[PDB]
Structure 1
Amino acid sequence: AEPQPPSGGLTDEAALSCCSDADPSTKDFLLQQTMLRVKDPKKSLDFYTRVLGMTLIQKCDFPIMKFSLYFLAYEDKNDIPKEKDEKIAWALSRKATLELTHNWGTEDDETQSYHNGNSDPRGFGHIGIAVPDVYSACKRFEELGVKFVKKPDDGKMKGLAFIQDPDGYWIEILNPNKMATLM
């Protein structure tokens, strides 16, 4: 192949040609969790449960290695099994869970903070919550003192916001029905 001018995006045809159908060995795979490290689980738990309305579905403590895992999800607390074995199997088979990792001590270290991936070095950008109404969700967020990266009507793309959690991780607030207009 001879050298080509700067490509640009992939075309739809190009992207589609890079995609294979799902092998039957993957048919039961599910995207179960996204893991973020948190400095202070008290502030993180208050933010994800009170501000965003998630439920704590599982807490795991590792006394020797000195860390805790918190699993948050949009689940009715009435569906949490009472028996601890059944609870962990149910929690870790939920789609779309958020795993917070607390390395014991980070809440007592004034020089410690995690990196949100949205400045050098970049990688992870954000989690995103679909909401029925971005403007009313963001008005409530304002009233609860939530720090904003992008208010819904600031920047080029109207109807879409970014807030941050107590560690500074970016959270997109989007309305699926308004994303078509943004194209």
Structure 2
Amino acid sequence: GGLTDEAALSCCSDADPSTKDFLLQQTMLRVKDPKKSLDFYTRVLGMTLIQKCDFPIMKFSLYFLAYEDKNDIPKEKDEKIAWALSRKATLELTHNWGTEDDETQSYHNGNSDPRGFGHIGIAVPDVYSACKRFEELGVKFVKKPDDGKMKGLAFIQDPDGYWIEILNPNKMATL
């Protein structure tokens, strides 16, 4: 069975003062091809590339994507890193160099064995108009808004096959 509301609450503690000012900053996903992923997250989902970091010795790049106004990106290099890495709710895309040329390589989306991570989710004003546009742009759907039991909730996928929930918090079905 599931936990009762009371049982859940008994497992929770109040925020220790040392965790003052902690924020949830990033979620990292590995991406096979950064060209494809950048196009998807910026053109399809409307996110902005706020920081790109390269590490030539270690042969990887990090791309930080966020719902931020491109005009708020600082001009100076050091000021830019501090700003981008202090934004709430960023997506960190990791490019291990060479993966895009390896035909036998792909990443795993966590939705088949072995499972773990499931999805990121984007809150939108209207699930139907958002998905209508996704269809016109040829986006791959795991679940269209009105497919199955739960109406008004969708799952799409990115170029690596990671699932992205599309939800309207104002129009969630009753529990």
Structure 2 length as normaliser, TM-score?
Answer: 0.99
Q: What CA distance in whole angstroms lies between the structure 1 residues aligned with 2:32 and 2:158?
A: 11
Q: What CA distance in whole angstroms lies between the structure 2 residues aligned with 1:165 and 1:181?
A: 29
Identity of matched residues, %: 100
Count of residue correspondences = 175
| Offset at residue 97 of structure 1 (A) | 0.1
Q: What CA distance in whole angstroms lies between the structure 1 residues aligned with 2:173 and 2:108?
A: 32
Q: What CA distance in whole angstroms lies between the structure 2 residues aligned with 1:81 and 1:73?
A: 15
| Offset at residue 179 of structure 1 (A) | 1.7
Match of 2:121 among 118, 125, 128: 128
1:14 to 2:14 alignment: no
Quick check: 2:24–2:88 contact (8 Å CA) kept in 1?
Answer: yes
Q: What CA distance in whole angstroms lies between the structure 2 residues aligned with 1:109 and 1:85?
A: 34
| Offset at residue 180 of structure 1 (A) | 5.0
Q: What CA distance in whole angstroms lies between the structure 2 residues aligned with 1:108 and 1:181?
A: 47
Structure number with greater Rg is 1
Q: Where does residue 41 of structure 1 map in the other structure?
A: 34
Q: Where does residue 3 of structure 1 map in the other structure?
A: none
RMSD, aligned α-carbons: 0.7
Q: What CA distance in whole angstroms lies between the structure 2 residues aligned with 1:92 and 1:179?
A: 32
Q: What CA distance in whole angstroms lies between the structure 2 residues aligned with 1:111 and 1:46?
A: 23
Task: Give runs of ≥4 in structure 1 deviating > 6 Å.
Answer: none
Q: What CA distance in whole angstroms lies between the structure 2 residues aligned with 1:179 and 1:10?
A: 22
Matched residue SS, 1:155:
coil
| Offset at residue 181 of structure 1 (A) | 3.2
Q: What CA distance in whole angstroms lies between the structure 2 residues aligned with 1:180 and 1:168?
A: 26
Structure 1 length as normaliser, TM-score?
Answer: 0.94
| Offset at residue 178 of structure 1 (A) | 1.1
Matched residue SS, 1:181:
coil
| Offset at residue 155 of structure 1 (A) | 1.1
Quick check: 2:150–2:173 contact (8 Å CA) kept in 1?
Answer: no
Matched residue SS, 2:118:
strand
